[PDB]
Amino acid sequence: TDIYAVNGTEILLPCTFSSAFGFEDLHFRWTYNSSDAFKILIEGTVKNEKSDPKVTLKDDDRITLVGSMNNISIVLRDLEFSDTGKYTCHVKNPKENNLQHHATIFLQVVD
């Protein structure tokens, strides 16, 4: 679904997971898709349900993890019109052979 944000401001793009019985070695990835580009924005690991995420890839310095729920939300600051597009959070649980794709967020940056 759609979120609107003003050029030059910041926006929080949310991602929460929950685990019935915890987890080990969770991996996450946020992606961006536009009509002509794809970007892996940030990737990381979470050792278990009692650990903080560890970022292993960040390709834009305007992105930060929000910090903790079972939360891998990101804040994107200093928005530009080219930031308009589709943002998707993906969570992989190798041990459970599980991969969840959260609903794509269409961010529209406006003047």
Swiss-Prot record:
Contains an interchain disulfide bond with SCN2A. Belongs to the sodium channel auxiliary subunit SCN4B (TC 8.A.17) family. Expressed at a high level in dorsal root ganglia, at a lower level in brain, spinal cord, skeletal muscle and heart. Expressed in the atrium. Changing residue 89 to A/W: Decreases protein stability. Causes conformation changes that impair interaction with the alpha subunit. Glycans are attached at residues 7, 33, 71. It is linked to Long QT syndrome 10: A heart disorder characterized by a prolonged QT interval on the ECG and polymorphic ventricular arrhythmias. They cause syncope and sudden death in response to exercise or emotional stress, and can present with a sentinel event of sudden cardiac death in infancy. Atrial fibrillation, familial, 17: A familial form of atrial fibrillation, a common sustained cardiac rhythm disturbance. Atrial fibrillation is characterized by disorganized atrial electrical activity and ineffective atrial contraction promoting blood stasis in the atria and reduces ventricular filling. It can result in palpitations, syncope, thromboembolic stroke, and congestive heart failure. It is found in: Cell membrane. Residues 1-111 are extracellular. Regulatory subunit of multiple voltage-gated sodium (Nav) channels directly mediating the depolarization of excitable membranes. Navs, also called VGSCs (voltage-gated sodium channels) or VDSCs (voltage-dependent sodium channels), operate by switching between closed and open conformations depending on the voltage difference across the membrane. In the open conformation they allow Na(+) ions to selectively pass through the pore, along their electrochemical gradient. It comes from the Eukaryota. Residues 1-106 form the Ig-like C2-type domain. Disulfide bonds join 15-89. This is Sodium channel regulatory subunit beta-4. Coiled coil: none annotated. A voltage-gated sodium (Nav) channel consists of an ion-conducting pore-forming alpha subunit functional on its own that is regulated by one or more beta subunits. The beta subunit SCN4B is disulfide-linked to the pore-forming alpha subunit. Interacts with SCN1A; regulatory subunit of SCN1A/Nav1.1. Interacts with SCN2A; regulatory subunit of SCN2A/Nav1.2. It comes from Homo sapiens.
